[PDB]
Amino acid sequence: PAKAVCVLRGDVSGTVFFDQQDEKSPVVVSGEVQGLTKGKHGFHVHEFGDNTNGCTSAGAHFNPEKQDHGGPSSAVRHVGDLGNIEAIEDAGVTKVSIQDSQISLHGPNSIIGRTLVVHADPDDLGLGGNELSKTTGNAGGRIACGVIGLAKI
Amino acid sequence: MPAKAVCVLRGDVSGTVFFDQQDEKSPVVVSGEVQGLTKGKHGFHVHEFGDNTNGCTSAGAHFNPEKQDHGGPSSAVRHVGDLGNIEAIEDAGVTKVSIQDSQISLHGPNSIIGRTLVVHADPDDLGLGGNELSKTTGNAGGRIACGVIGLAKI
Numbered sequence: 001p002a003k004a005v006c007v008l009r010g011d012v013s014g015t016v017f018f019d020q021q022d023e024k025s026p027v028v029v030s031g032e033v034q035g036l037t038k039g040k041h042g043f044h045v046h047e048f049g050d051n052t053n054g055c056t057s058a059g060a061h062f063n064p065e066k067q068d069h070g071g072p073s074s075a076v077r078h079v080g081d082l083g084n085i086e087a088i089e090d091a092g093v094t095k096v097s098i099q100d101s102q103i104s105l106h107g108p109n110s111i112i113g114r115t116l117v118v119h120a121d122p123d124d125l126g127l128g129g130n131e132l133s134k135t136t137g138n139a140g141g142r143i144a145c146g147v148i149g150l151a152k153i
Numbered sequence: 154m155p156a157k158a159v160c161v162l163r164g165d166v167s168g169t170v171f172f173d174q175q176d177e178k179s180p181v182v183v184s185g186e187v188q189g190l191t192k193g194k195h196g197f198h199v200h201e202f203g204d205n206t207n208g209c210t211s212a213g214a215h216f217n218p219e220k221q222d223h224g225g226p227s228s229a230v231r232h233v234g235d236l237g238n239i240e241a242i243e244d245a246g247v248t249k250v251s252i253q254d255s256q257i258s259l260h261g262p263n264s265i266i267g268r269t270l271v272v273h274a275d276p277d278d279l280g281l282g283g284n285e286l287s288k289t290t291g292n293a294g295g296r297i298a299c300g301v302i303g304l305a306k307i
């Protein structure tokens with residue numbers, strides 16, 4: 001089995017774990033984010049684990065299958081598309097509790113060494129009918145991010 | 154195909170370190186620099202976890218897939234993560250990092266992607282110290298900066 005972790009750096013903080021039991025099974029993504037503004041926040045794995053230029057150098061959404069942007073349940077989506085995490089209140093602690101079959105901790109869809117990004121605005125899941133929607137989901141600015149690294153156990 | 158990775162060091166000192174590998178079978182070339190080191194040798198290793206949950210402490214021990222004891226990069230017995238020392242020629246300067254190693258890789262069993270690069274306060278004795286810590290940490294002491302090693306653009 002495999003485990004990875006991301007510690008967010010930026011306007012919000014938090015520790016997000018990734019657990020995968022077998023190469024064939026989905027990845028369970030858990031942990032908590034603190035200091036999010038109330039509301040929905042876009043949440044994606046971006047291609048590069050590069051923070052030489054803050055979250056900007058993370059590049060675009062991780063997209064090994066060469067698709068347009070969507071939500072995690074969209075028929076068309078980036079592998080890195082994990083939708084929104086939602087703060088129910090201002091200045092609280094948002095639980096992260098996601099499972100996804102596209103991302104992996106092994107092989108071509110492996111997210112090890114890539115970057116988890118939290119956004120300022122809601123991910124519209126690619127339903128905005130413009131170029132931005134098909135690329136970023138109009139999630140706006142990158143407010144925090146971290147490189148996804150191998151974790152204990 | 155050719156691979157690249159990068160690590161941004163944060164802590165008491167800072168820096169950016171690049172890793173380049175032409176082939177899955179070629180050595181890894183490590184370049185970049187570290188700013189602010191005190192004059193002298195400073196231990197420099199890849200640690201096993203890319204885990205920053207408890208600062209550089211949670212990066213765990215030196216990356217060691219071959220189950221060996223600590224040494225320098227040229228030691229017959231070493232950790233894969235053992236990259237020896239970086240040496241600051243002056244106080245408060247910028248130290249060039251210029252290393253090539255064939256044990257570390259950006260692919261496979263020995264891949265360092267998703268692991269942590271750590272700079273230490275004291276010199277790594279390359280496992281030629283006369284105590285138990287030598288054969289494990291090289292007596293490099295405090296972890297003064299670290300970063301997770303991430304994939305970088307071609």
Ligand SMILES: [Cu+2]
Nearest residue numbers: 042043044117
């Ligand atoms: Cu994003």
Ligand SMILES: [Cu+2]
Nearest residue numbers: 196197198271
């Ligand atoms: Cu070390």
Ligand SMILES: [Zn+2]
Nearest residue numbers: 061069078081
């Ligand atoms: Zn996307």
Ligand SMILES: [Zn+2]
Nearest residue numbers: 215223232235
């Ligand atoms: Zn070692």
